[PDB]
């Protein structure tokens with residue numbers, strides 16, 4: 001049970017910026033007033049996104 | 051979150067795994083012993099500094 005959507009117009013998407021996005025909490029460890037640094041999968045700042 | 055760390059990288063915070071209760075660290079007691087005494091030829095009285 002599905003309907004084919006053939007009314008979609010083909011067009012390449014535009015590109016925007018990623019100034020201060022992609023950050024998230026590293027783990028489930030509470031941190032207060034500490035400058036903790038770690039290696040993790042993180043979106044680069046000011047990067048190209050679609 | 052279940053655990054926590056301080057500025058000295060010590061597990062000073064923990065979460066109870068049975069209810070929404072959070073606990074921290076505040077020491078029961080402490081002590082640094084140091085004994086002040088004169089020479090054995092002079093006398094034998096001693097005193098302890100904490």
Ligand SMILES: *[C@@H]1O[C@H](CO)[C@@H](O)[C@H](O)[C@H]1NC(C)=O
Pocket residue numbers: 015016017047048049
């Ligand atoms: C991202 O890349 C596309 C294609 O490489 C380009 O057209 C677009 O201008 C880029 N955007 C930025 C913000 O650099």
